[PDB]
Design a protein around this ligand. Structure first.
Ligand SMILES: COc1cc(NC(=O)Cc2ccc(Br)cc2)ccc1C[C@H]1COC(=O)N1
Length: 1037
DNA sequence: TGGTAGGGGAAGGAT
DNA sequence: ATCCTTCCCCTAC
């Protein structure tokens, strides 16, 4: 009969816009080859491979790429008698769409589903694979969204006193819509129960009656909540139908192994006829939700496919050396490297190279690849850009990669390709996902996102930005840093030349793209982001896509929604806040005596658990808790100049406390199975426990997001206030109970074998949020760890309710208290520890980092300069503006002056002198507008360079003042109409031979030394700079 | 729709 | 000139 849902992906083409560079035409004179052919053409799109040629949209007998498609434009390319009986299947993503009966009356659906989507119904599509390998999609009918409104509040406000009345009023209100979107919608299209529930906020809140309204269309529900009865609090109206499917059917997950089973009236699932399909899948099914169950024994991934891809483009305008722009039809997409792996076997299966102008890849590349067990690359030759892109999208639709990865493909590759397919060549994308049409293929620019239905996009860029700490995230730098495999860099400045020389010098470009994509693939399967995120999704009841791109809040919200709905609440729709921690004012300096480091194990979550903090256990009014005994039944606490009451556990158990306790016991359970488990299983177990730790640390934050979903800043500020009180109490306890060594020996008969020469003292020296650093003069750092363990156990037992726990983690031999939240120390195990200083701050140049590192390394791993710090301590350090520095410090001078050498002596690496700085916002919204990386940004923009994406790190260097520098400064100032305007791209400032500001980098090295070593001189900065000048020849001051 | 503390460097105004 | 403010980077919990 034909398809029931029109396939919008291109399967036929007779005429297209042909654009291609004239540089590829050899029979043209070398003078008539500069421009770029652009114009309409009326020929069937074709692709060349290995001397043979075939139409792009030709599918069947002979193909150049692999194909996993069945339907292709109403053609059933499946061997007749293809009726694989499906029992179990894995699910990775879930689609939420709408289906109307009038539309589907063509398709031969069972009566049940047509009843489920009578006027309109919401259908939940599970996408995945069978164990055999078949692509599968099961359509779940019956899922209904629903939301609550207070009955006593609606009855009186809408002058109605019955649920059918509410149905009438909602239907009517939807009729007189702006655009008459819902014409003819009547009251019988809604279901309205009356049910008893309790708002989640405040303990005083008692149950009441709420209308529950069921809705079949996300559009209808959205419009209702947005402008129905704006004066009436609406509950759980944001809960989408997928979340209802997961929560209301207990046990289901958003990622894992399901099984079809008999249903309520001995109902079986029904397979769809191919002409009814709505996905690029091999078999599809219709079922109600009771036809589903979970399969338990299954634990391993199925044959999901991962496409890693990178692109490379060339300009075409008057300046072919500038950076391309997808909006200009002259700049074109020249090459696309595309490699497909199997995710269950982590094995590369195919390599493909789309190219404008045929080529042959270099032989060194081919030999390396063929020798590394990899497959034989297959090049695809195209005459136009449209044919190349159309073939790429046809590959995407036919092979149907369930996962897609690359590097910075969110801010460059996909937006370029889709801007080409959209603005220039006018191509619909809604079918080029998993759905045959009406799908999702958008790209967004507090985070950039890429959402493709049935296609999981994981940009390894973000993965590395979160997991690895670097100064710049160029793919080669990341490769050398993580795999220790350096590969060739590339720039657009070199691409046109390599293209013009011919097929071999363009095959070089192909080698570069394929090496990039191989590297990305290696990173991917080292970090396994798919398994990590899939485990998070399974934990939070949220589909993998929203797991990646839609933030954290949604996860905690979904689990809390599950628990509250289970326990009789309903979450109300809402759609520097509170005093944080106090850093213990440290008395600075170098400490050589043993230092002990205590800290709490998950302080904030344990506070929540112990004191039963929750939305439902909080109260702002005394009369609410005036009927129970203070202290024994509730906790009174003053937070932010206001009294708060938290009813204790035995009155009303906290929702947050339950979530935390269950998650924790779950984590402990799965971690107790790591030993007696195969490493294959142990990777999955570790990803699982990682996800659990993530959401557990996500609770408190979720509570503190003012104007977020379900915020309650009272809980957050109570948490912080309790933490501060706990630290203060720990300090005062250690001071008062163990001031006398008599007591130490008393509690622990182990300080006998630990009494040191000097006098005995024990005082808290440092503290931050959940940490205590205690000085132990008069004690030997022998087993200070193993005795501090019994100490912290004693403190926890004697001071804090469970599950609050204090542990002893590290004991320092020497430690440098620099300033607040900044310190360096040497652990008793010989390991160094650096926190807060410019050492760890990846915004400084590698030279000053290495220098300051050597300085501190000397300060800790050289006995003479350590004794010299002790001698600086012997005296008040105030007098030393006229006194001489002890001999031990000599070494410093040496290193310092070596610096000067490396600064001015050429043949040094300029990359060893680059600064970095992240571009936070869109630059138009800025208060100073006079920043280094902003200057570099605007200069890069004027120069038609690579405009940096909206949130990367920009590198830069500092120029010295010249006549050209000041002249161009005045000229740019007049065009717009010394301070650190001397900032330049390392690229431009190396090829133009620009010289660095030698004074600035030495003056900073002196500044970082001043900041790091002000501690040893009573923490005075001016004094430290002055007596630092005593390590530098005065001809440099 | 990820929280509060921090320190220190760059730039600019006020004392 | 000296400070004193404010913004901005990136840390530590
Ligand atoms: C690493 O330290 C901390 C990180 C955080 N992070 C966040 O709150 C970020 C966040 C995540 C998710 C959502 Br939704 C909202 C915000 C909070 C407190 C501490 C302090 C420590 C001390 O004791 C703790 O339990 N955490």
């Amino acid at each position: 009969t034909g398809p029931t849902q029109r396939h919008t992906y291109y399967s036929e083409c007779d005429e297209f816009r042909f654009i291609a560079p004239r540089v590829l035409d050899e029979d043209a004179p070398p003078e008539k080859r500069a421009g770029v052919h652009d114009g309409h053409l009326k020929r069937a799109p074709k692709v060349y491979c290995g001397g043979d040629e075939r139409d792009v949209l030709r599918v069947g007998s002979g193909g150049f790429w692999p194909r996993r498609s069945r339907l292709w434009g109403g053609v059933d390319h499946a061997p007749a008698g293809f009726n694989p009986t499906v029992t179990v299947f894995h699910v990775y993503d879930i689609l939420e769409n709408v289906e109307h009966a009038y539309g589907m009356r063509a398709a031969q659906f069972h009566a049940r589903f047509m009843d489920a989507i009578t006027p309109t119904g919401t259908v939940i599509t599970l996408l995945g694979l069978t164990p055999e390998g078949h692509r599968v999609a099961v359509h779940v009918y019956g899922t209904r969204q629903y939301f609550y409104m207070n009955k006593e509040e609606v009855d009186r406000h809408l002058q109605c006193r019955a649920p059918r009345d509410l149905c009438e009023r909602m239907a009517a209100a939807l009729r007189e819509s702006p655009g008459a979107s819902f014409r003819g919608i009547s009251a019988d299209h809604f279901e309205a129960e009356v049910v008893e529930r309790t708002d989640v906020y405040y303990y005083e809140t008692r149950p009441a009656l709420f209308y529950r309204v069921y809705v079949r269309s996300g559009r209808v529900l959205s419009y209702l909540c947005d402008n129905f009865c704006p004066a009436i609090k609406k509950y759980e109206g944001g809960v989408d139908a997928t979340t209802r499917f997961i929560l209301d059917n207990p046990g289901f997950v958003t990622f894992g192994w399901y099984r079809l089973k008999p249903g309520r009236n001995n109902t079986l699932a029904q397979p769809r006829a191919p002409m009814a399909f709505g996905t690029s899948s091999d078999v599809e099914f219709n079922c109600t939700a009771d036809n589903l169950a979970i399969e338990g024994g299954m634990s391993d991934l199925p044959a999901y496919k991962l496409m890693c891809f990178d692109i490379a483009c060339k300009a075409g305008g008057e300046d072919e050396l500038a950076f391309p722009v997808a909006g200009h039809p002259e700049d074109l997409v020249i090459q696309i490297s595309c490699l497909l792996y199997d995710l269950s076997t982590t094995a590369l299966e195919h390599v493909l190279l789309f190219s404008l102008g045929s080529c042959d890849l270099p032989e060194s590349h081919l030999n390396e690849l063929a020798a590394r067990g990899l497959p034989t690359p297959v090049v695809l030759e195209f005459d136009s850009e449209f044919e190349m892109l159309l073939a790429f999208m046809t590959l995407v639709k036919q092979y149907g990669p369930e996962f897609v990865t690359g590097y910075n493909i969110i801010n460059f590759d996909w937006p370029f390709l889709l801007a080409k397919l959209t603005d220039i060549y006018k191509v619909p994308l809604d079918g080029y996902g998993r759905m045959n049409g009406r799908g999702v293929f958008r790209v967004w620019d507090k985070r950039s996102k890429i959402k493709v239905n049935g296609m999981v996009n994981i940009d390894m860029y973000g993965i590395i930005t979160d997991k690895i700490k670097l100064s710049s995230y160029k793919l080669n730098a990341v490769a050398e840093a993580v795999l220790k495999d350096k590969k060739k860099d590339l720039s657009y400045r070199d691409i046109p030349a390599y293209y013009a020389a011919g097929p071999a010098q363009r095959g070089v470009i192909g080698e570069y793209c394929i090496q990039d994509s191989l590297l990305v693939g290696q990173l991917f399967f080292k970090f396994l982001p798919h398994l990590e995120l899939s485990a998070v999704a399974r934990l939070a009841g949220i589909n993998i896509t929203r797991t990646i791109y839609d933030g954290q809040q949604i996860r905690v919200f979904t689990c809390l929604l599950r628990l509250a709905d289970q326990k009789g609440f309903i979450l109300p729709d809402t759609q520097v806040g509170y005093q944080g921690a106090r850093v213990h004012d440290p008395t600075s300096g170098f400490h050589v005596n043993p230092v002990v480091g205590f800290d709490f194990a998950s302080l904030y979550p344990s506070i929540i658990q112990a004191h039963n903090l929750c939305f439902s256990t909080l109260s702002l009014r005394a009369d609410a808790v005036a009927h129970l005994e203070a202290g024994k039944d509730y906790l009174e606490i003053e937070v932010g100049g206001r009294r708060l009451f938290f009813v204790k556990a035995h009155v009303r158990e906290s929702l947050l406390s339950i979530l935390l306790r269950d998650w924790l016991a779950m984590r402990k359970q799965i971690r107790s199975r790591i030993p007696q488990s195969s490493p294959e299983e142990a990777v999955l177990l570790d990803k699982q426990q990682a996800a659990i730790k993530v959401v557990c640390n996500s609770v408190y934050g979720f509570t503190g997001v003012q104007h977020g979903l379900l915020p309650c800043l009272h809980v957050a500020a109570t948490v912080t206030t309790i933490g501060r009180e706990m630290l203060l109490a720990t300090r005062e306890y250690v001071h008062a109970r163990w001031a006398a060594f008599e007591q130490l020996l008393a509690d622990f008969p182990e300080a006998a074998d630990m009494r040191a020469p000097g006098p005995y003292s024990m005082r808290i020296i440092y503290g931050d949020t959940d940490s205590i650093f205690v000085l132990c003069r008069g004690l030997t750092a022998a087993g200070l760890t193993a005795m501090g363990d019994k100490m912290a156990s004693h403190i926890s037992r004697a001071l804090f309710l469970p599950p609050i726990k204090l542990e002893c983690e590290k004991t320092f031999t020497k430690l440098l208290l620099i300033a607040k939240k900044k310190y360096i120390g040497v652990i008793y195990g010989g390991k160094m520890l650096i926190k807060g200083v410019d050492l760890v701050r990846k915004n400084n140049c590698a030279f000053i980092n290495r220098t300051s590192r050597a300085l501190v390394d000397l300060l800790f791993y050289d006995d003479t300069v350590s004794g010299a710090a002790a001698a600086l301590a012997e005296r008040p350090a105030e007098e030393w503006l006229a006194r001489p520095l002890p001999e031990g410090l000599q070494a410093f001078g040496a290193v310092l002056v070596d610096a000067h050498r490396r600064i001015t002596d050429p043949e040094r690496d300029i990359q060893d002198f680059v600064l970095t700085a992240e571009l936070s916002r869109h630059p138009r919204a800025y208060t100073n507008k006079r920043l280094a990386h902003l200057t570099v940004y605007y200069k890069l923009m004027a120069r038609r360079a690579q405009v940096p994406s909206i949130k990367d790190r920009i590198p830069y260097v500092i120029v010295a003042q010249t006549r050209e520098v000041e002249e161009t400064v005045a000229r740019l100032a007049a065009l717009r109409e010394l301070v650190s305007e001397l900032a330049e791209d390392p690229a431009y400032a190396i090829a133009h031979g620009v010289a660095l500001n030698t004074d600035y980098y030495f003056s900073h090295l002196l500044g970082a030394a001043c900041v790091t070593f002000k501690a040893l001189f009573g923490n005075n900065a001016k004094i430290t700079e002055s007596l630092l000048k005593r390590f530098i020849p005065e001809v440099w001051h």
